[model samples]
Target chain A: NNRYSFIGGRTGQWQVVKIRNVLGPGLQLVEKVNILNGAVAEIPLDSAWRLQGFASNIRYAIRTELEALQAVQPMLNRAEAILAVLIPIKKSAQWWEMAQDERRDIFERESHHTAVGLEYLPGVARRLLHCRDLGEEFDFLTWFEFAPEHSSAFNELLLRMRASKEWEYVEREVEVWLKRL
Target chain B: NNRYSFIGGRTGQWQVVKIRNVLGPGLQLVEKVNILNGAVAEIPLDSAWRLQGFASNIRYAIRTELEALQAVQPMLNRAEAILAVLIPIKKSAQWWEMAQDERRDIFERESHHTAVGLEYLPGVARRLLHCRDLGEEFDFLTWFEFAPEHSSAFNELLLRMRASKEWEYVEREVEVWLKRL
Candidate 1:
């Protein structure tokens, strides 16, 4: 897939940002071809189709907020690359059958899900994007960004999370890893 | 991740397939050591778990029947490698509210997905694995396999489908690619 970047802000510069890839600079643009109607095309790729939206109706419940804020410095300092993984999973029926408080207990206290993650807090930046309510493919897009130096620690953290009691209810989850260009 | 293949048949014989990478064989497995408690390891790799099952409560309501089946043969021959993408997306509330016949018209007649896909058939094999009824992460696994030679054609097929009227309900879709080892 091709990545297109645009200048954001109030500035009137409507320019496309150029970026580099693993090999070097991405492919340079060439003559454009019209596919649909055979209408003779031009040089630039057309921007006829565009889409943008934010995930909506997100649940506000979070198990815990505690973290090791001090670890953030070392993580950023040693980091040279970024790793983002998209995880889409559905909770089993048994999980939804439990009471709200019961689910919370398992998520935080019993399974220690939050505690285990707290250990790698600032070291591994995390974000949970809920998609179930939005009727998306994956219920949660759990994104994490960390440096290569801390990958082993990140793997350990994942092992703990996957082995947690809360994970028992997870039926399907696929992890997609990406590196910064 | 490493891909392992073995010959299968009634001859009661087995063979392993090994090949060099673009650079060379990745990091060699030095010792068969266990990481997770009690997990036995093996050379090249070991059969971790072998299990398979059919999807239950599959809805056989296809939205369209029109397709260009003649184009399938050419696509298959041009393909040099295979890429299978599994897309699991949930239907939006607006989609489920429509009548079955209405959906069929929009999906087949309006979107022209079948026709577009038919344009690259055989070269690009496709399968639909239902998962919503099974309570999986994604609703359906839209699996597609094609050779590298026809990658652009396959991509065009996807672009058309994604831009179709029926795709309005697609909240999430993840593309997974696989190549011959």
Candidate 2:
């Protein structure tokens, strides 16, 4: 939840120059907060736990993207600057890093998400670190664009229930794009 | 963000309660926000201003109730206990007041706001005051429930919006609710 001054301008403008560098000023070595251990995370039970489970998945996925982006700072900086400057957004610039075929599939999925009243969690890390409740959207562009090449399959695994067969084609497409990159 | 330990047992409840009453904690003010005016009443821009507006309303409402409740304590010990049980919920509930009717309207109007996805921000103050976006849904329901008498007009506003032509019905419904204890 710490702010970085290096970007030196508006929030939206702060590019991912050195993603790791953002954690620079406020890194702490506090003990981790896993409640499964001796730590006791408080709560009400039953319905509340169910709600927590659902919300936690959202929290997890959001945390994944945020943490991943932070971890893959190098690729993100390169990719962000590249697409931000060069891409026409003829395709959503976010998913452009994926293969043309994958990009097309993403484009179709995103279009569907939009039509169904959904949106991507913007500023992925911001959403995670700050606990920002992003309204639902198919985050294909975001995941496809910046997810580390290795995690694409895992990401696809997570999406299978919703995306089904479309998930496979999307991963293959993203893999092809990853190789090109 | 003040932390008060809940009593470990039934008998210790009064002692814990006493600590809170004496402490008057969570007085941490929004300092960094650049307010528009520092005299009379300071109003910070955007973030702080919006926050202070909500906080000011809560402060006023709570103070008003505190005085009345204090005056009537002896006669209404049972009522007071019920109020005590509900206070933590009503006061701490995160973003629960915005009934479904309200969210649809705000999303329609303020498509640009990332925070509008919060269901309670539009309808009630307490809910949004401490609201956080933890994934797509922050814990939408905390263990607390709004004390029946202390609920606000936010839901009424949305109901009004939904039935603009039926102002008479909305007015009657609102007044009926407000008249509750």
Candidate 3:
């Protein structure tokens, strides 16, 4: 079965990027990653990893704003895009309890998540996958890709998100880097 | 004694603008306004409708952000400027219980209140007066001034503020317009 995995011990083809803990207990340190994808499939006890999620639809989007996001967001596999970033996040139980409409209000109507995403433009490509329902350690895993030069822009995006109201609900977050070079 | 008042009954020199309520039980409606300014002073208040506050210092502002806010903010009185907007707000009890530092965190560090204000620039003259400490009905009185054309920009500014996390604390808000034409 084809899947993506972050094999900590075994050396892998994917480049090892920064594995940072934004909050909560840190994921195990690892230099190598292996294939293990799709949502919530049980992995071996010794796989030595933390990466499981199939890229899925954007949640909490109003149709109009959803279309707007699709229009400007770049794709993942551009030739210059040698760097890929993956962040795994888990939200507080309180966040999970919000009604679907309420989460939408906080996610977009109030935080302007989609609007802020527009500020970065074609410089960054973004993707997300859900895992909470699939019974993973994290609720969601999001990926970002851009040229090396866009790293600063990527950092700014991270800073803005960390400072947003939506960030308060985040219980755990970690970032991993994978390079193509 | 000269006190800035929003007397609803007796028309006075200060222009009367919209007293529309943004939330909570609406304050008594009045077309005319009278001044009874300064923090916490007794008012016959039967004298007329809602409006009591002495223009005072910015609360929850760190020294650096305070200076930056003062530097670019326009003055209240200007030749071509005729529209003055005053918004009085009362916050929920839950918001007030947070320590001062926590409120500061929510006000600027997270919500980007100062940063968003920067977007409007010298086009919008801004001032804030504290009243929660006062015996007044509202917690704060904020005033904005700009030329008529900037009304749209002013509205946009309001839109930005309303969408922010800090706005959730606001339990009552009313806008009153003053024209110098």
Candidate 4:
């Protein structure tokens, strides 16, 4: 009774509940969660309950791209399923040496980052988080989501951008994928 | 159909499937999901599959702490839900230079980390993933998950421990929450 209480002294305050498989190696409770498609029938269950991947970060400027922002707004409103990906990238030193305006060109017109993303439109929703300033892992963690029907379109969008002139500056990247359970 | 194929030029080669929001500002989806029990229960089932937070990094040696590892293993068995907290630390140079044996002394006896964690046991299961060496944003991604019933206990565990000696060296940290929706 008293042991269950959370507040206590520095050392002997709470009691240990003793778990059975703390380090069960992989996928601790697969059977319990039921990834095989039972409870939630509408959504097509995938290979894994959740998939995590990482991608190298790319350095480019999109702060002033009003068109880009406008393109994604409507997409956010219609998003259904979540396709979350964490992309971490390391840029080449040469990328830093370029003049600000030059970098902007490669980021926008030359690379077509914004253009490609715009093509995806309302089907694919996206968000960009900066990691470089924080000295965390990647320079930018780009996240996107959409419904299952549009998966192919999203794939095409990424292929177009990755092949663009901008991705060359990327040195390291990791991509992680996960689904909502 | 061929468009689904990722074989093309420089960026050619990444099959995109349709996917899905949360944080809207700056990083947009990277912003941070504040799970308020309303839509889809309490936790907003959007954005990245999971949002991870971490600190800078630190060098230490805890390999021989059999007592510490044994103390927490059992708690894993009864853990109903997962509460993962990625804590990245920025330790003073002085903390790093201390020999492994010396650091062990501080971590075990002085910090009392193992003892403190043991208190929350079954209700609060945890995992410490090293992120520093990987050149990640945070040094350690501390993950913990517990059933809804034990949410309060988990909160108290964090409150008390954050006030301990170990957290003294933490210069920066970010906390992200995800529910198994």
- lDDT scores in order: 0.45, 0.24, 0.70, 0.45
Native contact fraction per model: 0.00, 0.00, 0.00, 0.00
Looking at model 3 chain B, report the run of 10 residues with the lowest lDDT sum: B35-44
* TM-score of every prediction relative to native: 0.33, 0.21, 0.46, 0.34
Per-residue alpha-carbon lDDT of candidate 2 for residues A123-174, written as tens digits (9 for 90 to 100):
1111111111111111211212333443434344334423643333332121
Model 4 error, position B23 (Å): 20
Q: In candidate 1, which residue pairs clash?
A: B72-B121, B75-B123, B76-B123, B81-B147, B81-B148
Tens-place lDDT per residue, model 2, B1-181, is 2111121222222212221111112212221212121121232233221211111111112233334434432332333222222111111122233332233234233332223213332223222222222221111211122233434443343443434322212111101011112
Measured with C-alpha atoms, the lDDT of residue A146 in candidate 4 is 69
Question: Between the candidate structures 3 and 4, which one is better when assessed by DockQ?
Answer: 4
lDDT of 3 at B42: 56
Give the winner by lDDT: 3
lDDT of 1 by residue, A79-133 (tens): 4535543334567668755544466667777887755777775667755544343
* Predicted candidate 1 versus true structure: per-residue lDDT over B1-181, tens digit per residue: 0111111111212121221121211222111211121112232244332111122221212322312243343432224534444344567767655543456568767987666666676677655544443233445555456666777887787678878898888766644344433
Taking the tens digit of each residue's C-alpha lDDT, what string does model 3 give over A157-176? 99998888888899999888
In angstroms, how far off is B48's CA in candidate 2? 14
Clashes of 1: 5
| Model 1 chain B lDDT-worst window of ten | B1-10
TM-score of the first chain alone, every candidate? 0.59, 0.17, 0.87, 0.60
